[PDB]
Amino acid sequence: GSSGSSGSGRLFVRNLSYTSSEEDLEKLFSAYGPLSELHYPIDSLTKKPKGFAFVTFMFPEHAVKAYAEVDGQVFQGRMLHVLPSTIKKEASQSGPSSG
């Protein structure tokens, strides 16, 4: 096994309690680090989520720390599940590194 390779801090999360709010999550993950973008889908009818969301971390280092801790945690009586997901599309031309 290998530590991993940099690229995108994207992670597939599921099992979200309908009692959670787009904000609640922001803080839950934010803790680990800065969030590049959050995706919290909500039914236009019931006005509630489907129990899944997508968190995009700015840096991979953090994304890993969270995927190691979050993956197997409990929140609002709902076991949060995190899995590694990579952009399966040619959207990212390249991934430069500054500093």
CA-based diameter of the chain, in Å? 47
What is the C-alpha to C-alpha distance for residues 75 and 66, in angstroms, rounded to an integer?
14
Which run of H or of E encompasses 24? helix 22-30
Domains and CATH numbers, the chain: 6-99 (3.30.70.330)
Tokens read off for 82: 């995190």
Exposure pattern of 76-99 as b/e (b: 16+ CB <10 Å)?
eebebebeeeeeeeeeeeeeeeee
Rg, the chain, Cα only: 14
Tokens read off for 19: 């009692």
Experimental method: NMR
What is the C-alpha to C-alpha distance for residues 43 and 93, in angstroms, rounded to an integer?
33
What is the C-alpha to C-alpha distance for residues 40 and 36, in angstroms, rounded to an integer?
14
CA 27 to chain centre: 12
